[PDB]
Amino acid sequence: IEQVDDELLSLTAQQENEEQQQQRKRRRHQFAPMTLEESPSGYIKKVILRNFMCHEHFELELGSRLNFIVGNNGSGKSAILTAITIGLGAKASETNRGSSLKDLIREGCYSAKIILHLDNSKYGAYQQGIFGNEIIVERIIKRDGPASFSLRSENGKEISNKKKDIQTVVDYFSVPVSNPMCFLSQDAARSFLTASTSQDKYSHF
Amino acid sequence: SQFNWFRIGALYNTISKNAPITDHLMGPLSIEKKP
Amino acid sequence: DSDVDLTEDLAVAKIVKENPVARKMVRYILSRGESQNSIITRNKLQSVIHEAAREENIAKPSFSKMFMDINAILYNVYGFELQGLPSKNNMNAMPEPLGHRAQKFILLNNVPHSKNFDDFKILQSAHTYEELIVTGEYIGDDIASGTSNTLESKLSTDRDLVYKGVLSVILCIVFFSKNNILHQELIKFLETFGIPSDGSKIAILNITIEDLIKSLEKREYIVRLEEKSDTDGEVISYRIGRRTQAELGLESLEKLVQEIMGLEKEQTKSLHDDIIKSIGDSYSI
Amino acid sequence: GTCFDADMDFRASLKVRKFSGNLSFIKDTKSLEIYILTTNDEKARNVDTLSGGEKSFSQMALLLATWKPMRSRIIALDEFDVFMDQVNRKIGTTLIVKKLKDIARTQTIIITPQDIGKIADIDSSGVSIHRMRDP
Amino acid sequence: PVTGDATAKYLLQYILSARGICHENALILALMRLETDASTLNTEWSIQQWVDKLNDYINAINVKLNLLGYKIIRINHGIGRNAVTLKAKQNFENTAIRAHNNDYAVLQSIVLPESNRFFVYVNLASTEETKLATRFNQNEIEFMKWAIEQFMISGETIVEGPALETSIIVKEVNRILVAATGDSNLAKWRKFSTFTVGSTNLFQFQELTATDIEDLLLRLCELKWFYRTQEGKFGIDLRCIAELEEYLTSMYNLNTCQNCHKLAIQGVRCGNESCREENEETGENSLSQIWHVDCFKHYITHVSKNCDRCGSSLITEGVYVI
Amino acid sequence: NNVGSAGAVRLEKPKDYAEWKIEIMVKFRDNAPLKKLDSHTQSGGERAVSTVLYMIALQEFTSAPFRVVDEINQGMDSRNERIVHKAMVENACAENTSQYFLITPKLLTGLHYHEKMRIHCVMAGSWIPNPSEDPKMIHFGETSNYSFD
Amino acid sequence: TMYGSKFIPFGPKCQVTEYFKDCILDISNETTNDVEISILKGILNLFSKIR
């Protein structure tokens, strides 16, 4: 069967590409000696949502370790999680919050802005010399035209406008946005917490 | 499978033998865990 | 005598309230002697009474008092009563039942039988049996109908009735065969009804004949007397157990056999003497 | 490694309720079995042989012990108040607070409609409540 | 203990001999045949007082059972009115006398054209320290638990098509609907409920083989615990829900009918999509707003014909539960 | 059957006549799969019970008046030995059976004694007189001798 | 060889072990890697847990 040989060759070529990609990666941590108790960098200091879903331009200063948003249900309670998942970069189907990225835009407005402020002042920062003490991540969703980006810094200097820099920064900070369990929505949490059969627990884990 | 194996069985255990008959439902199926 | 019944019920309620362990023992007896329809042993009674007393931290009452309370509760609530059984060695080697000094006991009903209620039950069973196995079929996964016996019938589990019928046939064979029937000839006679003797499982029950006979012997329905010899070989003789003797009396056997052959009620005479002759040395009475 | 981290975190989580348990991963049955020993008994019964509150607490502890092996800088979660009823819900929120406020590597955003300020366990530092003034 | 005690004992023994649950008309006929030999012939009587003379004796047995640790519950069957009363040409009491349903009438002519409530012998004890088994081992108990879990899970249906399986329940539902109002246009909605449905899923048990599963299921069907429909789908009968009243409410989150507290197994359940809140996991009326068949008939023929669950039109209602 | 296990002595017959072999089905232990009898894989007591029962099966067919077994009642787990004693009791229930000279080097608590079989004791006591001088002590482990006939 | 000495001790709060693990998780891909990377990840996790 020549199809089996073709599949074998394709799998072998895929393994070759994967091992080249592994060989390409280098070390990214420099081990600044410095001083433990203090949180490392990368946490979200603040999120601002301008004309996003229901409410208007809104500021929210998230805490360093544990945050308890008490936005009541039916008042855009899930808007913050959707905004964080979209801004950090995630597949729309994985989020399952809204029919399309167009619907996330507030009705009556053509564009919506999601701006995140990751912290770089503390240790573990990603290029703290270039980005400074904060890294700003702003995503624009417009009804017409593609969704735009910029990974600007505190001074407003747009460091990049691409998306691969998003992935590099996020992977350096180790934020599993691609994993739909680190950012649990309502339905996912309900499915996990109500698991009864041991097989279901094994599957979910 | 031609003869009444129930009519004779109905005469027995009812007219004679005065044997108590109880369903004995599956009570131990729902055993409380008494936490 | 309504006031007599009311005060008897009040006394029974007071007795069952005074002795909580009695209620649990009655429940355990109603479970064991009815679910498995087996004979309750004397030895296990002391163990279960002691365990219940230790669990309830109540001083152990007298065994005779406990037995009397259990019988009173059964007669006042379910109408049942516990009758003692003799020892099997007495037969091998009017007697009032032991009651308190017997090694085995069995639940028995003690209310006279009516004339139409049993007729109603047997007629309902016959009506359901005409469609249970119509055209040589069976209910369950075999056909597309599950609630064949309407919403509820008298068929119970559709196999307990067959078991009781086979038991009655076996008892009639043993009782009327001079109280001495061999295994091979008993199988040959049962073959006339239609039960295969080649080892194939019987219908409905799905139990082989040898296993059915073993279960009957285990449940004290029959006794496997073994007068094995040499010229011929091993000899299996079937007897009547004490459980059957207690369940079936002279009048009870006469009533059962009256409808077996469909004899008219006018000729009821000269039949009890024949039944006694056929029974022979079977009852310790 | 992942199963070891999950097992250890589940054991450390059950200590909040004065329990002692473990996780068992079986490939023959392809199942995860939770064994919990509470104060009354002396044998680790199967987790299904328990009550609603204990099972809900075990499920929440399993959720945390599944978050643990995958070191995530940011974790976000929606409401859980409808899956736990009255006292068990308070105990579950207490477990979340106690197990998540200590770690500095992981920032957690919990979105709940229930007011945490009503819970007496708000005096602990490192917990940020942002109650929306606009309903 | 001359006449009344004997009659009470006979009634209780007849109830027990029918595997707990027994038809009320059978109990009425048994009481008639017991009383006709108790005090004269009782030819000149009325059913309106016969039902009371049965109910008082039932309560007298029930209080004794309660002080002993049991109870007889007059739980109404899911199917009611004439659909369950008809049975096979009413009560059973032709070349020979083998099939005569309308013959052997009690006294001159006695018949009960209405009967809905069934009497079931149940045990109120939960822990049940005294009893540990009846005739089965632990493997059968595990299989029974798995079957109960599968039946509970199968209650929720995703979409369902217009298959319109018409054996028993949907005929009565359509009769009630046309009695309430004559539409005959869209009464048969394309939404179905499979609360008691399973054919192949029960066969997927691991410990027991196919033959053992078949034997156990047949034995349970003969014991009147799991019943089969005309299609051939197994499901829990009234006996199981009558006994396990707390097992289906504590372990599994279930709601009651319009009554104070009762187990709903069949009837009408639409719920649209906005259920009461969101519940633990399942929705679509998983917290409240469920009706029986007789309950639905009573509710639709009285005031507030429309559903009280925040408003629901009759067009979308009429969901058949099997 | 008394062991609660199913087993049959099958004669597998391949095409070659010399390749015919004997298979024994084992079910006394659920963990142990159905295989030929062997000491290392199976426990000693279950194997001893199985081979003793196989010996017993080939007794009625044989014309030998009796069979002799030595070092058999010595304890096998006190459970397999109990069930093989039960099997021996059941075999002794049948009449015209071979007489076995049983040896019990180690005493077992709660041994079952059938009415058909009789136990013999050879132990001597300090307070018991010498067997030669005592007329009734010459018989050891016998009770029917004292009674008339 | 290093772990357990005065310079690199067992424990959860040491900085050196965190830096080592940070680099190991950087290289580790779990799809096409040298087994030594996964062995290091497991060993470093174990030594971090040891108090």
PDB file of N, CA, C and O in Angstrom, chain A residues 40-41 43-44 61 63-70 72 75 77 97 173-174 176 179 181-182 184 186 192-193 195 198-199, chain D residues 6 29 31-33 59 66-67 70 72-73 75-76 78-79 101 103 105-112 116 128-130 135:
ATOM      1  N   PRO A  40       6.464  37.665  40.610  1.00  0.00           N
ATOM      2  CA  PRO A  40       7.211  37.943  39.382  1.00  0.00           C
ATOM      3  C   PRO A  40       6.398  38.812  38.438  1.00  0.00           C
ATOM      4  O   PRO A  40       5.216  39.085  38.654  1.00  0.00           O
ATOM      5  N   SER A  41       7.058  39.255  37.373  1.00  0.00           N
ATOM      6  CA  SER A  41       6.400  40.116  36.406  1.00  0.00           C
ATOM      7  C   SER A  41       5.457  39.303  35.522  1.00  0.00           C
ATOM      8  O   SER A  41       5.426  38.070  35.563  1.00  0.00           O
ATOM      9  N   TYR A  43       1.987  39.717  35.417  1.00  0.00           N
ATOM     10  CA  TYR A  43       0.592  39.794  35.815  1.00  0.00           C
ATOM     11  C   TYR A  43      -0.053  41.052  35.243  1.00  0.00           C
ATOM     12  O   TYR A  43       0.615  42.036  34.917  1.00  0.00           O
ATOM     13  N   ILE A  44      -1.376  41.009  35.126  1.00  0.00           N
ATOM     14  CA  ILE A  44      -2.139  42.113  34.555  1.00  0.00           C
ATOM     15  C   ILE A  44      -2.385  43.147  35.648  1.00  0.00           C
ATOM     16  O   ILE A  44      -3.081  42.873  36.628  1.00  0.00           O
ATOM     17  N   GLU A  61      -8.393  47.720  37.818  1.00  0.00           N
ATOM     18  CA  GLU A  61      -7.043  47.420  38.293  1.00  0.00           C
ATOM     19  C   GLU A  61      -7.071  46.079  39.015  1.00  0.00           C
ATOM     20  O   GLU A  61      -7.431  46.001  40.190  1.00  0.00           O
ATOM     21  N   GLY A  63      -5.658  42.801  40.942  1.00  0.00           N
ATOM     22  CA  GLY A  63      -4.621  42.605  41.930  1.00  0.00           C
ATOM     23  C   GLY A  63      -3.555  41.628  41.469  1.00  0.00           C
ATOM     24  O   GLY A  63      -3.661  40.987  40.425  1.00  0.00           O
ATOM     25  N   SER A  64      -2.503  41.518  42.283  1.00  0.00           N
ATOM     26  CA  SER A  64      -1.324  40.766  41.865  1.00  0.00           C
ATOM     27  C   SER A  64      -1.543  39.260  41.951  1.00  0.00           C
ATOM     28  O   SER A  64      -1.061  38.512  41.093  1.00  0.00           O
ATOM     29  N   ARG A  65      -2.251  38.787  42.978  1.00  0.00           N
ATOM     30  CA  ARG A  65      -2.348  37.355  43.237  1.00  0.00           C
ATOM     31  C   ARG A  65      -3.762  36.809  43.077  1.00  0.00           C
ATOM     32  O   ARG A  65      -3.977  35.883  42.292  1.00  0.00           O
ATOM     33  N   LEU A  66      -4.737  37.350  43.801  1.00  0.00           N
ATOM     34  CA  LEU A  66      -6.096  36.832  43.765  1.00  0.00           C
ATOM     35  C   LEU A  66      -7.075  37.978  43.582  1.00  0.00           C
ATOM     36  O   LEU A  66      -7.028  38.970  44.313  1.00  0.00           O
ATOM     37  N   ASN A  67      -7.966  37.834  42.606  1.00  0.00           N
ATOM     38  CA  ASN A  67      -8.927  38.870  42.265  1.00  0.00           C
ATOM     39  C   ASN A  67     -10.334  38.302  42.335  1.00  0.00           C
ATOM     40  O   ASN A  67     -10.586  37.170  41.914  1.00  0.00           O
ATOM     41  N   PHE A  68     -11.254  39.098  42.878  1.00  0.00           N
ATOM     42  CA  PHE A  68     -12.649  38.680  43.031  1.00  0.00           C
ATOM     43  C   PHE A  68     -13.531  39.783  42.449  1.00  0.00           C
ATOM     44  O   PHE A  68     -13.986  40.675  43.169  1.00  0.00           O
ATOM     45  N   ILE A  69     -13.772  39.711  41.146  1.00  0.00           N
ATOM     46  CA  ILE A  69     -14.682  40.638  40.488  1.00  0.00           C
ATOM     47  C   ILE A  69     -16.105  40.285  40.889  1.00  0.00           C
ATOM     48  O   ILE A  69     -16.526  39.129  40.766  1.00  0.00           O
ATOM     49  N   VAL A  70     -16.853  41.276  41.368  1.00  0.00           N
ATOM     50  CA  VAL A  70     -18.195  41.027  41.879  1.00  0.00           C
ATOM     51  C   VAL A  70     -19.172  41.742  40.951  1.00  0.00           C
ATOM     52  O   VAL A  70     -20.227  42.230  41.372  1.00  0.00           O
ATOM     53  N   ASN A  72     -22.142  41.835  38.821  1.00  0.00           N
ATOM     54  CA  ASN A  72     -23.314  40.976  38.894  1.00  0.00           C
ATOM     55  C   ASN A  72     -23.605  40.339  37.541  1.00  0.00           C
ATOM     56  O   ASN A  72     -23.307  40.902  36.484  1.00  0.00           O
ATOM     57  N   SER A  75     -24.773  41.807  33.808  1.00  0.00           N
ATOM     58  CA  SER A  75     -24.199  43.137  33.652  1.00  0.00           C
ATOM     59  C   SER A  75     -22.809  43.052  33.032  1.00  0.00           C
ATOM     60  O   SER A  75     -21.885  43.763  33.430  1.00  0.00           O
ATOM     61  N   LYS A  77     -20.785  40.389  33.234  1.00  0.00           N
ATOM     62  CA  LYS A  77     -19.876  39.762  34.188  1.00  0.00           C
ATOM     63  C   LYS A  77     -18.769  38.988  33.479  1.00  0.00           C
ATOM     64  O   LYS A  77     -17.611  39.015  33.909  1.00  0.00           O
ATOM     65  N   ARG A  97     -17.621  32.927  23.443  1.00  0.00           N
ATOM     66  CA  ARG A  97     -18.294  34.085  24.029  1.00  0.00           C
ATOM     67  C   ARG A  97     -18.632  35.045  22.894  1.00  0.00           C
ATOM     68  O   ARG A  97     -17.817  35.896  22.526  1.00  0.00           O
ATOM     69  N   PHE A 173       6.058  34.769  29.326  1.00  0.00           N
ATOM     70  CA  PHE A 173       5.331  34.908  30.579  1.00  0.00           C
ATOM     71  C   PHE A 173       4.602  33.635  30.985  1.00  0.00           C
ATOM     72  O   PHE A 173       4.124  33.558  32.121  1.00  0.00           O
ATOM     73  N   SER A 174       4.512  32.647  30.095  1.00  0.00           N
ATOM     74  CA  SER A 174       3.876  31.359  30.377  1.00  0.00           C
ATOM     75  C   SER A 174       2.403  31.538  30.751  1.00  0.00           C
ATOM     76  O   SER A 174       1.961  31.196  31.848  1.00  0.00           O
ATOM     77  N   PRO A 176      -1.004  30.169  29.459  1.00  0.00           N
ATOM     78  CA  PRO A 176      -1.651  29.232  28.532  1.00  0.00           C
ATOM     79  C   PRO A 176      -3.001  29.722  28.036  1.00  0.00           C
ATOM     80  O   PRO A 176      -4.049  29.215  28.448  1.00  0.00           O
ATOM     81  N   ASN A 179      -4.825  26.966  26.103  1.00  0.00           N
ATOM     82  CA  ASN A 179      -5.472  25.920  26.885  1.00  0.00           C
ATOM     83  C   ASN A 179      -6.795  26.438  27.435  1.00  0.00           C
ATOM     84  O   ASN A 179      -6.795  27.396  28.215  1.00  0.00           O
ATOM     85  N   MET A 181      -8.611  25.514  29.739  1.00  0.00           N
ATOM     86  CA  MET A 181      -8.874  25.283  31.154  1.00  0.00           C
ATOM     87  C   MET A 181      -8.287  26.373  32.041  1.00  0.00           C
ATOM     88  O   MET A 181      -8.846  26.664  33.102  1.00  0.00           O
ATOM     89  N   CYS A 182      -7.166  26.972  31.638  1.00  0.00           N
ATOM     90  CA  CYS A 182      -6.594  28.049  32.435  1.00  0.00           C
ATOM     91  C   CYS A 182      -7.536  29.241  32.514  1.00  0.00           C
ATOM     92  O   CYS A 182      -7.516  29.980  33.503  1.00  0.00           O
ATOM     93  N   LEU A 184     -11.271  29.445  32.537  1.00  0.00           N
ATOM     94  CA  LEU A 184     -12.510  28.683  32.577  1.00  0.00           C
ATOM     95  C   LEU A 184     -13.711  29.602  32.415  1.00  0.00           C
ATOM     96  O   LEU A 184     -13.914  30.520  33.215  1.00  0.00           O
ATOM     97  N   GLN A 186     -18.068  29.861  31.988  1.00  0.00           N
ATOM     98  CA  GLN A 186     -19.139  29.325  32.821  1.00  0.00           C
ATOM     99  C   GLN A 186     -19.468  27.884  32.446  1.00  0.00           C
ATOM    100  O   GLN A 186     -19.567  27.012  33.317  1.00  0.00           O
ATOM    101  N   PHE A 192     -16.853  20.715  34.198  1.00  0.00           N
ATOM    102  CA  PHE A 192     -15.813  20.098  35.017  1.00  0.00           C
ATOM    103  C   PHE A 192     -16.305  19.799  36.429  1.00  0.00           C
ATOM    104  O   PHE A 192     -16.065  18.707  36.955  1.00  0.00           O
ATOM    105  N   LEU A 193     -16.984  20.756  37.064  1.00  0.00           N
ATOM    106  CA  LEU A 193     -17.318  20.606  38.477  1.00  0.00           C
ATOM    107  C   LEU A 193     -18.425  19.584  38.702  1.00  0.00           C
ATOM    108  O   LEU A 193     -18.536  19.029  39.801  1.00  0.00           O
ATOM    109  N   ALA A 195     -18.669  16.730  37.034  1.00  0.00           N
ATOM    110  CA  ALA A 195     -18.229  15.405  36.618  1.00  0.00           C
ATOM    111  C   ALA A 195     -18.502  14.387  37.716  1.00  0.00           C
ATOM    112  O   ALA A 195     -18.158  14.602  38.882  1.00  0.00           O
ATOM    113  N   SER A 198     -15.914   8.335  37.287  1.00  0.00           N
ATOM    114  CA  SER A 198     -14.457   8.376  37.354  1.00  0.00           C
ATOM    115  C   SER A 198     -13.837   8.514  35.971  1.00  0.00           C
ATOM    116  O   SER A 198     -12.783   9.146  35.823  1.00  0.00           O
ATOM    117  N   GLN A 199     -14.478   7.943  34.949  1.00  0.00           N
ATOM    118  CA  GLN A 199     -14.001   8.120  33.583  1.00  0.00           C
ATOM    119  C   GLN A 199     -14.085   9.579  33.156  1.00  0.00           C
ATOM    120  O   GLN A 199     -13.191  10.081  32.469  1.00  0.00           O
TER     121      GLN A 199
ATOM    122  N   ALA D   6      -0.541  16.720  40.867  1.00  0.00           N
ATOM    123  CA  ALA D   6      -1.974  16.757  41.141  1.00  0.00           C
ATOM    124  C   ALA D   6      -2.316  15.999  42.417  1.00  0.00           C
ATOM    125  O   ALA D   6      -3.113  16.475  43.233  1.00  0.00           O
ATOM    126  N   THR D  29      -8.775   0.583  33.986  1.00  0.00           N
ATOM    127  CA  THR D  29     -10.130   1.111  33.937  1.00  0.00           C
ATOM    128  C   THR D  29     -10.208   2.480  33.279  1.00  0.00           C
ATOM    129  O   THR D  29     -11.318   2.985  33.076  1.00  0.00           O
ATOM    130  N   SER D  31      -9.592   5.406  34.440  1.00  0.00           N
ATOM    131  CA  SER D  31     -10.408   6.212  35.333  1.00  0.00           C
ATOM    132  C   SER D  31      -9.561   6.808  36.448  1.00  0.00           C
ATOM    133  O   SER D  31      -8.502   6.288  36.810  1.00  0.00           O
ATOM    134  N   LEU D  32     -10.055   7.914  36.995  1.00  0.00           N
ATOM    135  CA  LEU D  32      -9.458   8.570  38.151  1.00  0.00           C
ATOM    136  C   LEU D  32     -10.354   8.319  39.355  1.00  0.00           C
ATOM    137  O   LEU D  32     -11.527   8.706  39.353  1.00  0.00           O
ATOM    138  N   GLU D  33      -9.799   7.684  40.381  1.00  0.00           N
ATOM    139  CA  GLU D  33     -10.520   7.346  41.598  1.00  0.00           C
ATOM    140  C   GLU D  33     -10.022   8.226  42.734  1.00  0.00           C
ATOM    141  O   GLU D  33      -8.813   8.336  42.956  1.00  0.00           O
ATOM    142  N   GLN D  59     -14.476  17.883  44.274  1.00  0.00           N
ATOM    143  CA  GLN D  59     -14.403  18.346  42.890  1.00  0.00           C
ATOM    144  C   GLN D  59     -13.673  19.680  42.785  1.00  0.00           C
ATOM    145  O   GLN D  59     -12.873  19.887  41.865  1.00  0.00           O
ATOM    146  N   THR D  66      -5.733  20.263  39.393  1.00  0.00           N
ATOM    147  CA  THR D  66      -5.488  20.203  37.959  1.00  0.00           C
ATOM    148  C   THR D  66      -4.893  21.499  37.431  1.00  0.00           C
ATOM    149  O   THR D  66      -4.099  21.468  36.484  1.00  0.00           O
ATOM    150  N   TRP D  67      -5.262  22.637  38.023  1.00  0.00           N
ATOM    151  CA  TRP D  67      -4.563  23.879  37.706  1.00  0.00           C
ATOM    152  C   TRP D  67      -3.106  23.839  38.151  1.00  0.00           C
ATOM    153  O   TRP D  67      -2.245  24.436  37.495  1.00  0.00           O
ATOM    154  N   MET D  70       0.143  22.402  35.741  1.00  0.00           N
ATOM    155  CA  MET D  70       0.431  23.320  34.643  1.00  0.00           C
ATOM    156  C   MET D  70       0.639  24.714  35.229  1.00  0.00           C
ATOM    157  O   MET D  70      -0.315  25.428  35.545  1.00  0.00           O
ATOM    158  N   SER D  72       0.696  28.180  35.469  1.00  0.00           N
ATOM    159  CA  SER D  72       0.089  29.225  34.662  1.00  0.00           C
ATOM    160  C   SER D  72       0.275  30.564  35.355  1.00  0.00           C
ATOM    161  O   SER D  72      -0.058  30.709  36.536  1.00  0.00           O
ATOM    162  N   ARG D  73       0.814  31.537  34.619  1.00  0.00           N
ATOM    163  CA  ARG D  73       0.998  32.872  35.177  1.00  0.00           C
ATOM    164  C   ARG D  73      -0.342  33.514  35.509  1.00  0.00           C
ATOM    165  O   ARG D  73      -0.479  34.183  36.540  1.00  0.00           O
ATOM    166  N   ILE D  75      -4.668  32.802  35.638  1.00  0.00           N
ATOM    167  CA  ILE D  75      -5.791  31.873  35.638  1.00  0.00           C
ATOM    168  C   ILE D  75      -7.054  32.689  35.862  1.00  0.00           C
ATOM    169  O   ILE D  75      -7.066  33.591  36.706  1.00  0.00           O
ATOM    170  N   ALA D  76      -8.103  32.396  35.101  1.00  0.00           N
ATOM    171  CA  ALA D  76      -9.373  33.096  35.227  1.00  0.00           C
ATOM    172  C   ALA D  76     -10.504  32.087  35.316  1.00  0.00           C
ATOM    173  O   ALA D  76     -10.423  30.997  34.743  1.00  0.00           O
ATOM    174  N   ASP D  78     -15.069  31.746  36.035  1.00  0.00           N
ATOM    175  CA  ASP D  78     -16.390  32.334  36.189  1.00  0.00           C
ATOM    176  C   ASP D  78     -17.050  31.794  37.458  1.00  0.00           C
ATOM    177  O   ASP D  78     -16.409  31.161  38.299  1.00  0.00           O
ATOM    178  N   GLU D  79     -18.348  32.044  37.608  1.00  0.00           N
ATOM    179  CA  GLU D  79     -19.031  31.748  38.859  1.00  0.00           C
ATOM    180  C   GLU D  79     -19.102  30.247  39.114  1.00  0.00           C
ATOM    181  O   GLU D  79     -19.139  29.432  38.189  1.00  0.00           O
ATOM    182  N   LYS D 101      -4.391  32.514  47.386  1.00  0.00           N
ATOM    183  CA  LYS D 101      -3.803  33.777  47.808  1.00  0.00           C
ATOM    184  C   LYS D 101      -2.338  33.639  48.202  1.00  0.00           C
ATOM    185  O   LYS D 101      -1.619  34.643  48.224  1.00  0.00           O
ATOM    186  N   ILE D 103       0.127  31.723  46.611  1.00  0.00           N
ATOM    187  CA  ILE D 103       1.063  31.626  45.497  1.00  0.00           C
ATOM    188  C   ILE D 103       1.167  32.968  44.787  1.00  0.00           C
ATOM    189  O   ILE D 103       0.154  33.599  44.457  1.00  0.00           O
ATOM    190  N   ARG D 105       3.302  33.285  41.924  1.00  0.00           N
ATOM    191  CA  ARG D 105       3.544  33.045  40.506  1.00  0.00           C
ATOM    192  C   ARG D 105       2.262  33.035  39.685  1.00  0.00           C
ATOM    193  O   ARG D 105       2.324  33.236  38.468  1.00  0.00           O
ATOM    194  N   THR D 106       1.112  32.806  40.311  1.00  0.00           N
ATOM    195  CA  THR D 106      -0.153  32.658  39.605  1.00  0.00           C
ATOM    196  C   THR D 106      -1.130  33.732  40.059  1.00  0.00           C
ATOM    197  O   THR D 106      -1.473  33.805  41.243  1.00  0.00           O
ATOM    198  N   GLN D 107      -1.579  34.553  39.116  1.00  0.00           N
ATOM    199  CA  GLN D 107      -2.578  35.582  39.372  1.00  0.00           C
ATOM    200  C   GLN D 107      -3.939  35.058  38.938  1.00  0.00           C
ATOM    201  O   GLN D 107      -4.109  34.646  37.788  1.00  0.00           O
ATOM    202  N   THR D 108      -4.909  35.095  39.847  1.00  0.00           N
ATOM    203  CA  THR D 108      -6.215  34.490  39.622  1.00  0.00           C
ATOM    204  C   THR D 108      -7.295  35.560  39.584  1.00  0.00           C
ATOM    205  O   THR D 108      -7.353  36.424  40.465  1.00  0.00           O
ATOM    206  N   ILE D 109      -8.142  35.495  38.562  1.00  0.00           N
ATOM    207  CA  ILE D 109      -9.273  36.397  38.387  1.00  0.00           C
ATOM    208  C   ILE D 109     -10.540  35.562  38.500  1.00  0.00           C
ATOM    209  O   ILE D 109     -10.897  34.834  37.566  1.00  0.00           O
ATOM    210  N   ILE D 110     -11.223  35.668  39.636  1.00  0.00           N
ATOM    211  CA  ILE D 110     -12.461  34.941  39.884  1.00  0.00           C
ATOM    212  C   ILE D 110     -13.624  35.910  39.746  1.00  0.00           C
ATOM    213  O   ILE D 110     -13.682  36.923  40.453  1.00  0.00           O
ATOM    214  N   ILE D 111     -14.551  35.605  38.844  1.00  0.00           N
ATOM    215  CA  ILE D 111     -15.717  36.447  38.598  1.00  0.00           C
ATOM    216  C   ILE D 111     -16.908  35.745  39.235  1.00  0.00           C
ATOM    217  O   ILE D 111     -17.329  34.677  38.777  1.00  0.00           O
ATOM    218  N   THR D 112     -17.457  36.338  40.288  1.00  0.00           N
ATOM    219  CA  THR D 112     -18.594  35.771  40.993  1.00  0.00           C
ATOM    220  C   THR D 112     -19.658  36.832  41.213  1.00  0.00           C
ATOM    221  O   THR D 112     -19.338  38.011  41.394  1.00  0.00           O
ATOM    222  N   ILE D 116     -18.354  38.576  48.155  1.00  0.00           N
ATOM    223  CA  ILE D 116     -17.357  37.973  49.031  1.00  0.00           C
ATOM    224  C   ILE D 116     -17.264  38.741  50.344  1.00  0.00           C
ATOM    225  O   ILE D 116     -16.967  38.156  51.393  1.00  0.00           O
ATOM    226  N   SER D 128      -8.051  40.650  46.364  1.00  0.00           N
ATOM    227  CA  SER D 128      -8.568  41.904  45.834  1.00  0.00           C
ATOM    228  C   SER D 128      -9.997  41.689  45.362  1.00  0.00           C
ATOM    229  O   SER D 128     -10.251  40.831  44.510  1.00  0.00           O
ATOM    230  N   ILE D 129     -10.923  42.463  45.915  1.00  0.00           N
ATOM    231  CA  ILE D 129     -12.329  42.419  45.531  1.00  0.00           C
ATOM    232  C   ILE D 129     -12.655  43.730  44.834  1.00  0.00           C
ATOM    233  O   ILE D 129     -12.453  44.811  45.403  1.00  0.00           O
ATOM    234  N   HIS D 130     -13.160  43.639  43.608  1.00  0.00           N
ATOM    235  CA  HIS D 130     -13.502  44.805  42.800  1.00  0.00           C
ATOM    236  C   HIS D 130     -15.001  44.745  42.539  1.00  0.00           C
ATOM    237  O   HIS D 130     -15.445  44.241  41.504  1.00  0.00           O
ATOM    238  N   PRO D 135     -24.811  48.286  38.700  1.00  0.00           N
ATOM    239  CA  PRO D 135     -25.434  46.963  38.602  1.00  0.00           C
ATOM    240  C   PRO D 135     -25.792  46.595  37.165  1.00  0.00           C
ATOM    241  O   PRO D 135     -26.434  45.568  36.952  1.00  0.00           O
TER     242      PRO D 135
END
